[PDB]
């Protein structure tokens, strides 16, 4: 840091600049940090009797952490539109981080009034691990983001983690991390903190949608030179006999043509409808779910593999867990009606990824003979096969930007299943805490742990700046594209704006896929 | 181009030269280009009532295109034999393309006679996209190749494409491309066209067959040090009891040994026989097929994944769609007998890829106990697992050389499923058209589209030269190999030769896999 | 791609309003054998998609400079005898072209007539005929009325294998406003 | 800004100097800035039933703004008289702007008494758009000027704007501007702010009257 109590440690920077190829964004927010857990660590675990699936064991810490991982932190609704309408892809490159204008307040709750005053000599300490030595919590899509709207103020969320358990009990291999055991940087009023970071090379995210379905790749005018088996028998006299005929596949045969490629893999979902009348009356929620089984307990696959949500001309149906779901403004935690949630749509991927609610295809179950008749069965789960292409899941406007790839001997197509960018060395976790200030010890000496501290909290401003790389488009498409538009009719409230009471709200999910490409 | 009406714009080059390591081929053909669609674009789509699988929507254009993508264009039957007998693999490197000796003819159909005469000032315009901006039709194995026999003359096939549809109706995302909207090069008599191209690095195609099956990798003389569970129970007194015994696996146990590897993936096929008596009497063609399901419609997998066609000592059976099929000389389009088609054989891959008509293996379905008995079931479909090796499908003599890998966020083992070389930037499409020449407009001015044109067509010679890279063989095999031989007995007609009426024909499919390698 | 007929049998004619007509409809002028090219409409230059990095992405645009070229000229003669019409090349015939550029002629363009280059690149169009009007009294000419012979300009005579070009620079002009206002 | 809590960030300058051809004026005032709207944006519009002429739609912001646009801020009654009696016209050329001696107070309203005390570490942030990206309110002759008399103290007026409406309802084209979305400069006690500006060429105002009809 630098200088005094009266001097300011940083300016407010929130802006976006568009350079063409590379593009840069900036934002600044205001935060407040409480003391958590009365300055002490605690182990936490599952509560008494619980399902074998719900057991957990871990620790909670006094430390907080910053999360900018959602897009809406970085991009405004309009800045989001010089991106998704005008470009075929984007990726991050490098970022900056800064804290400044730190001030610490102590509070006195005596009687029915609470007085608050500056504590000028108190400190707040911050570090960034950057060696990836801690359990990495970010990327699990928790709350506690920097707000989407720059004028809001937010608390910093508390930090904690989980470790191997058996039931509600720990195992010998289970690990315990003390955050005090790292070098950090102690800051007072008039001290600031910075670091900078560089993304590893990662593929552009695909903001295009395809103009060709994988099942139609070819010229309708010209027939193939390959033959397929067409008729298996022919009438002879009164009744048929076995005769094999072959054919070349034309535009009337398009079903039957040879191809060089296959659709992507599927792991199948249950289908439900937004119209309440079509759905069965029972509780199938947990029973009818698709799950995976790991170490004797069952977990839902909430996003699951990337698959189209519905087929043509059914907009009413979506996979049970297969989609992301966002809440509207002020929605509650539990048991809330469908009118409150916002359900995203995965469609444009129909052309490669198969629909999530249907089988991959059909396969032959048996060997035919004279007295046996051919039999097939549906394959509801398919792994990856050579010659198989697919697309990934869209990032939308608000959702995960990145995730940390687990450190393991093998992995396949690491792009993460919620969306965004898989990173082996992602942006490091930033951790922050209030330094404990003891209160009025006894006159005689005693060896005991202090239970008594001054009650205080801190606040300041944080800033983030990321540099993005863009991919422009050369398209010879003659006719116009599909663009993201706001409706021009009159309305009581404007979208993406404060209401009369001053609560900013986001009407609908906005994906990145509009501009079209050929497959 | 250069010079005059009387001067020739190029020499005839058709030759093959063998340098050892890198080898070069050349060919020249004669073509004729009609005007298509009366100089205008038309949208085309599926016809009225049709199966939901057969719907399509797209466009047809006046433009033509050149296709050299089949091997038999480049290699003669003998040149094919300093390749497949003498080498373990080959790949393309770079190619050239040239057009020359262009001449345009106009025709007059009045009465019962048709006069044809030079039009010396007319043009023909040509371009190569090379930025891959158009729908890419090649690689779908259509007709319209340069002929296999150098003395034949061929038309240029018409160009067209397809786009997203709903039923027979278009969707807002569907794209329309005007080929007039590209820069091209206008050519008259005495003008020529050239470009050159460089293949991206690609693995050699494997022209070897294996001398070891994956199930036998090891020394018969020496026992393993690992144990397998051999006997599950032992007789005690009158009746058996449960006792677990173990054993080390020797040459008598070869079934039971431990291995480091597994066979490739399968997607199973229905089996039919060339002998008409074994096949069931019914129509199972479409019903007994193996299919994939994409966006509510069903498509046959015609080649499917690469799998052996038959087991040992059954030559009579082949997968339903699982093989490529070629027609003999003069075979018709539809409903033709088996004696007319030529069926390729995939066998030498028995040693790694599993047979297409049988299951991958068996897997345990349940947990045993005292009163429960072990149960298993067949797995007819297997995706890729770690530690899994396989081979790709053979190219043969006539068939796809390359395909364009779709542009997508992910793909696995891009080698294409018909055969040949997957390319992200394949040889670009060449497009050609006759420039419209209007005929005799009215004296007064009118704004309308011309329906009346001079009737004309053009012809010339085209040339292609590709450079190939070869991989020689060092083999310590003592005994002789298997070579591709022509039969020495007397016959009415020589193979791969004109008959008495002058029609060149190809007797049988010829693959590239003869020389043997150890696994 | 264009096609140019011969107009008026190679000769000038005066034209005027027809007999009885409203006093508003009288006119007097001339029609000429000459044709002219009109690219003045936008849809000639911009495709529907190219029109969209413009209007969605920008607050204004203006022209700066342009080029013009003719080439691949070929002349055909026709024989209408009997019920059939034969058409054949005339290789030694010419076509002559000029650009006034001193603004000495009546300036017809800008009145939004037909005869544009087609919006769709694959279409073929005739070249429209050229003519003009001058001061009149009723259907009769006035002494001040002017008559222009286009043969009286230097032009450039072109045969098969001859081409024509010129280039032009727009004077400074304000951007067109493609924005709409957010405040009344 | 510069230096400390105890050091002063600027001197009081109010003066006028007359050079002949050009002439220069200066003034200094004292201001107080409340928090508006409890730190939050609100949309505002016309109230229920109203004449079709009176409908409006817009937003009000927590931000304040300075307005010196009236003459009496710059000229005293006597300085106004070496101008209008002695001259045929005048125009502006360039100006300066400065803020200094910033101090922030927190208040406690408990019971029937209100205590007020310094908050030394608090900030106040300021910016000037200068790219003309915001709705431009000044020039509509509102209240909130710097006082005509140098010894008076004034509040800073609240900022807000209006946008296209249909009746009391918004239209799709209507725009919303967040002032937090600009770079600004955060100031504590002992920090100061400045910028300077140059008028584009403009004709002299005509202070003559004609002697001929
Ligand atoms: N986000 C992200 N990171 C890395 N790889 C990705 C990603 N998304 C897809 N893939 C795929 C495509 C790369 O060629 C391959 C590299 O994996 P590995 O060798 O890193 O993984
Ligand atoms: N024809 C062809 N092209 C590319 N890759 C192929 C091909 N055939 C097989 N493979 C496999 C083997 C390569 O190591 C891998 C590279 O995929 P990707 O990273 O290109 O894909």
């Amino acid at each position: 840091g630098a200088d005094g109590v009266g001097n300011s440690s940083g300016n407010w920077h929130c802006d976006s600049t568009w350079m063409g190829d590379r593009v840069i964004t900036t934002s600044t927010r205001t935060w407040a940090l409480p003391t958590y857990n009365n300055h002490l660590y605690k182990q936490i675990s599952s509560q008494s009797g619980a399902s074998n699936d719900n057991h957990y064991f871990g620790y909670s810490t006094p430390w907080g952490y910053f999360d900018f991982n959602r897009f809406h932190c970085h991009f405004s609704p309009r800045d989001w539109q010089r991106l998704i309408n005008n470009n075929w892809g984007f990726r991050p490159k490098r970022l900056n981080f800064k804290l400044f204008n730190i001030q610490v307040k102590e509070v006195t709750q005596n009687d029915g009034t609470t007085t608050i005053a500056n504590n000028l000599t108190s400190t707040v300490q911050v570090f960034t691990d950057s060696e990836y030595q801690l359990p990495y919590v970010l990327g699990s899509a928790h709350q506690g983001c920097l707000p989407p709207f720059p004028a809001d103020v937010f608390m910093v969320p508390q930090y904690g983690y989980l470790t191997l358990n058996n039931g509600s009990q720990a195992v010998g291999r289970s690990s315990f991390y003390c955050l005090e055991y790292f070098p950090s940087q102690m800051l007072r009023t008039g001290n600031n903190f910075t670091f900078s970071y560089t993304f590893e090379d990662v593929p552009f995210h695909s903001s295009y949608a395809h103009s060709q379905s994988l099942d139609r790749l070819m010229n309708p005018l010209i027939d193939q030179y390959l033959y397929y088996l067409s008729r298996t028998n022919t009438p002879s006299g009164t009744t048929t006999q076995s005769r094999l005929q072959f054919s070349q596949a034309g535009a009337s045969d398009i079903r039957d043509q040879s191809r060089n490629w296959l659709p992507g893999p599927c792991y199948r979902q249950q289908r439900v409808s937004k119209t309440s009348a079509d759905n069965n009356n029972s509780e199938y929620s947990w029973t009818g779910a698709t799950k995976y089984h790991l170490n004797g307990r069952d977990s839902l696959v909430n996003p699951g593999p990337a698959m189209a949500s519905h087929k043509d001309d059914e907009e009413k149906f979506f996979p049970q867990s297969g989609v992301l779901i966002f809440g509207k403004q002020g929605s509650e935690k539990t048991n809330v009606d469908i009118e409150k949630v916002m359900i995203t749509d995965e469609e444009e991927i129909r052309t490669t990824n198969p629909v999530a609610t249907e089988q991959y295809g059909s396969v032959s179950t048996n060997l035919q003979r004279g007295n046996r008749q051919a039999a097939t069965a549906d394959v509801n789960t398919q792994g990856v096969l050579p010659g198989m292409v697919w697309q990934d899941r869209d990032v939308y406007l608000q959702g995960p930007i990145w995730a940390k790839i687990p450190h393991t001997d093998g992995h396949f197509h690491p792009s993460p299943l919620m969306g965004g960018f898989g990173l082996k060395h992602p942006p490091p976790q930033i951790l922050i805490k209030n330094t404990p200030v003891p209160a009025n010890p006894s006159t005689t000496f005693s060896a005991a742990k202090f239970a008594s501290f001054i009650t205080q909290y801190s606040t300041g401003q944080v800033s983030v700046e990321i540099e993005w790389e863009l991919q422009k488009e050369n398209s010879k498409r003659w006719n116009p594209e599909i663009q993201y538009t706001s409706n021009y009719n009159k309305s009581v409230n404007v979208d993406f704006t404060v209401d009369t009471n001053g609560v900013y709200s986001e009407p609908r999910p906005i994906g990145t896929r509009y501009l079209t490409r050929n497959l």
Side-chain angles (χ1 to χ4, degrees), chain A residues 88 205-217 262 264 312 346-354 389-393 477 481-482 512-519:
Chain A
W88 276 347
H205 179 62
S206 63
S207 62
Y208 56 88
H210 295 290
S211 63
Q212 289 176 330
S213 64
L214 185 145
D215 59 356
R216 309 286 186 266
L217 264 302
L262 267 62
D312 289 345
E346 292 299 320
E347 62 185 343
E348 300 83 357
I349 308 302
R350 291 177 183 172
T351 60
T352 57
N353 287 129
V389 297
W390 62 92
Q391 291 291 100
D392 287 342
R393 186 178 293 274
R477 175 177 179 168
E481 288 295 326
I482 292 171
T512 191
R513 289 176 178 169
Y514 289 92
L515 293 173
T516 300
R517 185 189 292 274
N518 55 30
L519 189 147

Side-chain angles (χ1 to χ4, degrees), chain A residues 402-417:
Chain A
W402 62 85
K404 179 174 177 288
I405 298 167
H407 187 64
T408 55
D409 286 345
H411 55 282
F412 179 78
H413 196 276
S415 177
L417 274 66

